[PDB]
Amino acid sequence: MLKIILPSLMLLPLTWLSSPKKTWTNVTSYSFLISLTSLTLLWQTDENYKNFSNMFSSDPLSTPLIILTAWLLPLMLMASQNHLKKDNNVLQKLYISMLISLQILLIMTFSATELIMFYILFEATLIPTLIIITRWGNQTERLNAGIYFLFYTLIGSIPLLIALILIQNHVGTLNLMILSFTTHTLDASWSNNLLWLACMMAFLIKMPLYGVHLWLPKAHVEAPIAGSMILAAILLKLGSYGMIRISIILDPLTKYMAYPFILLSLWGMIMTSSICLRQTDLKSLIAYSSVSHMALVIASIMIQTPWSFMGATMLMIAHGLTSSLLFCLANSNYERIHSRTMIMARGLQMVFPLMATWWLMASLANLALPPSINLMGELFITMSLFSWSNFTIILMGINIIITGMYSMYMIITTQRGKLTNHMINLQPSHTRELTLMALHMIPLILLTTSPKLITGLTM
Amino acid sequence: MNPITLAIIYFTIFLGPVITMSSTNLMLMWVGLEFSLLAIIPMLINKKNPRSTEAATKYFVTQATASMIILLAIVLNYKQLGTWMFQQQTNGLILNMTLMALSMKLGLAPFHFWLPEVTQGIPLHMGLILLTWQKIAPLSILIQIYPLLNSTIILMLAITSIFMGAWGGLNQTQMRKIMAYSSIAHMGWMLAILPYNPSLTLLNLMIYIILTAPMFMALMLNNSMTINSISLLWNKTPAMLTMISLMLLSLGGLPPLTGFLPKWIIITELMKNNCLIMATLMAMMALLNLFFYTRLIYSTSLTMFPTNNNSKMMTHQTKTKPNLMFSTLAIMSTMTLPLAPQLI
Amino acid sequence: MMNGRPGHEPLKFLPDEARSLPPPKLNDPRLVYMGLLGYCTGLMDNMLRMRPVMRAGLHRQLLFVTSFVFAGYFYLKRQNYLYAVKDHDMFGYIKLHPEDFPEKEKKTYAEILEPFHPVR
Amino acid sequence: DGPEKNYEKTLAILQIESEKAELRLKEQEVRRLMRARGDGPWYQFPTPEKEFIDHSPKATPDN
Amino acid sequence: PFLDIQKKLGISLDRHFMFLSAEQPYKNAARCHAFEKEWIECAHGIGGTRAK
């Protein structure tokens, strides 16, 4: 997998060497094709996964993501052509390159055989992200948000560093292939009960768990649209990908060491879903929607039943695409409105007829409408959770009712009701804004036709 | 300085560490340490400002008593073994003295009070020498005697330094002292692995030298001893803003940059030796060091502090360039990580 | 560590014994990296000194890309030796002190009985 | 090119990684042994050199 | 030692006088010269860990 990567690196030379006026089209057009080369990995045609070479591999779980990581770079660069079009021609070429490095790094992290290669690349992605959030962040508080995003991930990260070096000494190689075909069975000691927490905690932090998710609402609030898309679509899912590949070892402990997180997540799912119900900042509500719909995932990567896992793989890819779509349209309202407040800007369909159709489809993806991969995902996690304990439906049942309420409230108070009297007149929709959306949903429609590709390792 | 004097001094400041390293007769190692003490004091008071005399008089007393303690260890050994050099048989207290003494000259842990203060009153230039070409000498003496020193003490001085360095740095706003504090911290990691794998001490030093030397020549390019002063870097010289950003995050352990390797292999070696107690606590507060590094990042790069009109005047004039060493030592430092296996 | 080994060359860079090892291919990814590492140093310099970034010092750019690379071949040539000594040393010991590193028989899974924790 | 290429490539990747793993662990055991044993080329700490011991006939007769 | 510029250069400015059995002036043998020899020709080729 060096075509999904080397051609990517070369994007950096192109963003720099290219003309200031033509820099945007060379980069966006080329990474669209970079995504097309990424599609070749989908050609499995056999059970044996694809070990491209010693360090680089792609199995069913990584492949559905590498393609998404390559896909969003085009979109990210199309959603940030407006803001970041007021810059000095060298601030742009820095932002474009920063976005380019994220997927170079993220493509490799999702396509990495050695778990510590994951760690080095895993924690590197913070550098590009923190720059995108802090350097271009509009609000006074991004310095703070950046600190929260760096420390919560970093304090979790050093325990994983110690744990992975620890298993290398215990087993003798951090190669995901071998670690899988070798006998690593923890022994339920008090210490192992700590190892397990060391490995999972760093992944559980960037996958916002109810206890440590305050970093994500603060980060996406002041982050520029491209950073918020990256955090929701690819960055948070780095934590999920890690939990799937790391729990191959630590096989016995999670049977009983998971209860704490599972309950934290399911109760967390309800409270995070509910506070979405009365949050005035739209970007705030989407972020907590992201916490709740990701709290379902940590509760399926821990129950560990075949269906959970691919419920997880289905939902992660699906929610990634949906969340960005929501964060992208939130930005289009923010740029014309100039405020994140949900109460202002009422009645837009009256003035932006189509964006509202995109808003409606994004919300229906947000809630579980049935001919969507989003529902298949939740339906499956719901099933397994029920298997874990029939009572789980109650808590995963209060979340579904709340999820319907906030998803439609975003449509009802942003895209319906009487028009706002006279905010700065709202200029019509650009074709870029609409495509950036179409590019998010057309793939959501196509993937829903053949869900098999994003089903995970389990199935 | 009459250029002749400059030569004699500089030769001594350079013959000082070199005799230490080359000789085996400890005595000759002691005088190497003594010559470094004598040579550095003249340069320290070059401005001869009231702050400077204070600096040198502290540096000298701290250095002198430690030098006398190191000599006492050699004198005691001479009577416990006729040899003029530490051996397997050496009384444990004899070696511990040498650790404390040498940990004072290097300024590690509970003897970390002199360094921040002398780093504050000396010029940026002599600051570098006082931080990096004066650590080579004592460390050489320790690295030579590693097989014999105590694993317990070193670790305590190691951990303490890491903490003191980190905590001290958080509050400081003067750059010279932020660096002094960082050096205390890095010096700590170095002395942690000495008992186990000296060869890694020599990596955690070089990398520190290849990181700090560019960082200081950056601080002086604009001669800013204040963060507020380095924050207006964007107006005085915009290009160094990019690398100053990466070098400081490299000084802390963040993974893509070269700075991770020293911490990573030291942790790998300590876990190989089973200190998974000690290594863990060190790595954790090591993360505190990055917080103050990033706070500076914020002021200098990620956010643009307001500047002064008189600055437009300094822009007009051609900026005297930074030596080539900056580049070669900025890149070899910010990104060599892809070449770690051969470094270790 | 590896110092104190018999025959150690007290101050030599790469003892002739390292002749026996294969020479590093000049295009070894690493040496090529050092090259790029170098080009960047050059470009960076131009930038910090405020010169046209790429179109200036085309002589220097060469000195850099060619100094770093030169250094590489002769360094890697050594680091390669050091690693090679490590095996000579390591493998030898495994034998000279055989009992301590005994070959082990691993029972076919048929025989071994790892317990099965059910997920249910 | 086929199912054959990846299956055979993956087995080659596993053999390199399995052999690297066994050796890395054996290093740690050899390095534990030579440190304590001191019977191997690594961890051979120095003692004075007999090349300076003066074996000359000295003045007193018991040298 | 750390940098053996002495062995390399072949010079011996610091080794000739490190132990009591080294050449004493006018060949006035030291005291304990009967033993240090016996204790360093023993520990020669045997590293410290096994000179102890």
Binding site: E114 | - | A84, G92 | - | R50
Partner: peptide, 27 residues
């Protein structure tokens, strides 16, 4: 009796096995 000199590792160097075996470096 003098003690016995440590035994001597013997042979000729051969390129290291599988290369630097550092974390994930095919080398």
């Amino acid at each position: 009796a003098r003690p016995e000199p440590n035994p001597v590792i013997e042979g000729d160097l051969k390129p290291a096995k599988h290369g630097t075996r550092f974390f994930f470096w095919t080398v």
